[PDB]
Write an enzyme that holds these catalytic residues in place. Structure first.
Site, short mmCIF file in Angstrom:
data_model
loop_
_atom_site.label_atom_id
_atom_site.label_comp_id
_atom_site.label_asym_id
_atom_site.label_seq_id
_atom_site.Cartn_x
_atom_site.Cartn_y
_atom_site.Cartn_z
N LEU A 44 4.09 13.94 -10.68
CA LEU A 44 3.15 13.37 -11.59
C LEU A 44 1.68 12.94 -11.22
O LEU A 44 0.68 13.38 -11.53
CB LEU A 44 3.54 11.77 -12.25
CG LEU A 44 4.98 11.78 -12.68
CD1 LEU A 44 5.49 10.16 -12.90
CD2 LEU A 44 4.95 12.59 -13.93
N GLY A 45 1.74 12.37 -9.88
CA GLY A 45 0.59 11.96 -9.00
C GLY A 45 0.74 12.45 -7.61
O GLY A 45 1.61 12.93 -7.24
N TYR A 49 -1.70 8.19 -0.21
CA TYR A 49 -0.61 7.06 0.11
C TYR A 49 0.60 7.51 -0.26
O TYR A 49 1.58 6.77 -0.06
CB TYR A 49 -1.07 5.81 -0.77
CG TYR A 49 -2.36 5.25 0.08
CD1 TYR A 49 -2.97 5.61 1.34
CD2 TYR A 49 -3.41 4.44 -0.70
CE1 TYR A 49 -3.87 5.03 1.89
CE2 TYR A 49 -4.50 4.06 -0.27
CZ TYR A 49 -4.72 4.20 0.97
OH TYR A 49 -5.82 3.66 1.67
N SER A 50 0.67 8.51 -1.39
CA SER A 50 2.16 8.83 -1.93
C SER A 50 2.33 10.24 -2.70
O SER A 50 1.14 10.84 -3.07
CB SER A 50 2.56 7.79 -2.95
OG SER A 50 1.61 7.57 -4.09
N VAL A 52 4.24 11.23 -6.28
CA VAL A 52 5.15 10.55 -7.21
C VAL A 52 5.79 11.61 -8.30
O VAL A 52 5.01 12.64 -8.70
CB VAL A 52 4.13 9.63 -8.14
CG1 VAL A 52 4.80 8.91 -9.11
CG2 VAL A 52 3.38 8.52 -7.20
N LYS A 67 8.43 7.79 -5.69
CA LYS A 67 7.33 7.65 -4.91
C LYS A 67 7.60 8.05 -3.51
O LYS A 67 8.34 7.17 -2.80
CB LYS A 67 6.65 6.40 -5.08
CG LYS A 67 5.46 6.18 -4.19
CD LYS A 67 4.56 5.29 -4.86
CE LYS A 67 4.92 3.87 -4.95
NZ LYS A 67 4.43 2.90 -3.86
N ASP A 155 -4.73 -5.28 -4.08
CA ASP A 155 -5.19 -3.85 -4.42
C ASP A 155 -5.30 -3.75 -6.00
O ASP A 155 -5.03 -2.65 -6.67
CB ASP A 155 -4.24 -2.62 -3.74
CG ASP A 155 -4.86 -1.56 -3.92
OD1 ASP A 155 -6.37 -1.24 -4.17
OD2 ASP A 155 -4.37 -0.38 -3.33
#
Ligand SMILES: [Cl-]
Ligand SMILES: [Cl-]
Ligand SMILES: [Cl-]
Ligand SMILES: [Cl-]
Ligand SMILES: [Cl-]
Length: 333
Positions: A44-45, A49-50, A52, A67, A155
């Site tokens: 997905l992403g 930082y991650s 996904v 994640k 955030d």
């Protein structure tokens, strides 16, 4: 002599009244699940930082989201997990379903219940005035909830707000920067994205609180109703405060700095110079004015204050006239 202490106006002692193990995440023993229960379907992403993924839980055939966590200190891992578990079930909060580590690489992964891959930013220039108000209210539900549970998000930004516009569901996500609020505790100012950093972070004032999220929310609202993303477009850390000063004026900034006895770098004062407060109407043009109202401008004015103690709490924001009809209409959801 040094910086004057500050305290949160609301939810000040929430964690103090809680049992120790509620907020003491360092002592929390993480109960790990089995990664084998989950198979990745599609990506997905992807960021710094991650990673996904859409995924499936083979034990019950439920669609979930995975994640893969970038290598941060174990302390940060436990903190996010403990916070997610404390907030689990809360309104408009992402729901942590499970936690797993790779059998080989040992890399931790968070498993959330399914949400649709569409954040606020891809959408928050496409919907109506009522929709802006509506979703802003949904965000406040989440912010009031986590604050009441003694937790600062730190955030807040449209990328961290997932919206299933089809079913009008909203989820506040990415709690990797979140932290528990404790009276008198000094926090790291290197949180949030530049465009959404509150004045407190930019002047290195550490004893901040929940109100930090409210400034971030103001920046989000400002960008939407004015059709300007980001609203405060600083090109570096110093410039960010300059962009804010060019709008709110230098007078309120210096008063704010003096109020908490904050010490700025001498060159920062000359950089800031002198600027007069700008009226919110000056940012209104014929291609955004359908999202502008007197309620909106007053609401925005009450969020974007230098003084963190002066900003509306989430609850006060929720009963601002800006959401009057939204609240009325939601009363028959
Ligand atoms: Cl702690
Ligand atoms: Cl964003
Ligand atoms: Cl911190
Ligand atoms: Cl700007
Ligand atoms: Cl609050």
């Amino acid at each position: 002599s040094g910086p004057v202490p500050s305290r949160a106006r609301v939810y000040t002692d929430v964690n103090t009244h809680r049992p120790r193990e509620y907020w003491d995440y360092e002592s929390h023993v993480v109960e790990w699940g089995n990664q084998d229960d989950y198979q990745l379907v599609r990506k997905l992403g992807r960021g710094k930082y991650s990673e996904v993924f859409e995924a499936i839980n083979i034990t019950n055939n439920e669609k979930v989201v995975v994640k893969i966590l970038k290598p941060v200190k174990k302390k940060k891992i436990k903190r996010e997990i403990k916070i997610l578990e404390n907030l689990r079930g809360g309104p408009n909060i992402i729901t942590l379903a499970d936690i797993v580590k790779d059998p080989v690489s040992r890399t931790p992964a968070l498993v959330f219940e399914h949400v649709n891959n569409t954040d606020f930013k891809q959408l928050y220039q496409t919907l109506t005035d009522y929709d802006i108000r509506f979703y802003m209210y949904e965000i406040l539900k989440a912010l009031d909830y986590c604050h009441s549970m003694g937790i600062m998000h730190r955030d807040v930004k449209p990328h961290n707000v997932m919206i299933d516009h089809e079913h009008r569901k909203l989820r506040l996500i990415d709690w990797g920067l979140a932290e528990f609020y404790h009276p008198g505790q000094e926090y790291n100012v290197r949180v949030a994205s530049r465009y959404f950093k509150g004045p407190e972070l930019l002047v290195d004032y550490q004893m901040y609180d929940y109100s930090l999220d409210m400034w971030s929310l103001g920046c989000m609202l400002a960008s939407m109703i004015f059709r300007k993303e980001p609203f405060f477009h600083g090109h570096d850390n110093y410039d960010q405060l300059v962009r804010i000063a060019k709008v709110l004026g230098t007078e309120d900034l210096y008063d704010y700095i003096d109020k908490y006895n904050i010490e700025l770098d001498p060159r920062f004062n000359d950089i800031l110079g002198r600027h007069s407060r700008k009226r919110w109407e000056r940012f209104v043009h014929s291609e955004n004015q359908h999202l502008v109202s007197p309620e909106a401008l007053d609401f925005l004015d009450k969020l974007l204050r230098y003084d963190h103690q002066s900003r509306l709490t989430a609850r006060e924001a929720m009963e601002h006239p800006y959401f009057y009809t939204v609240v009325k209409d939601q009363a028959r959801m």
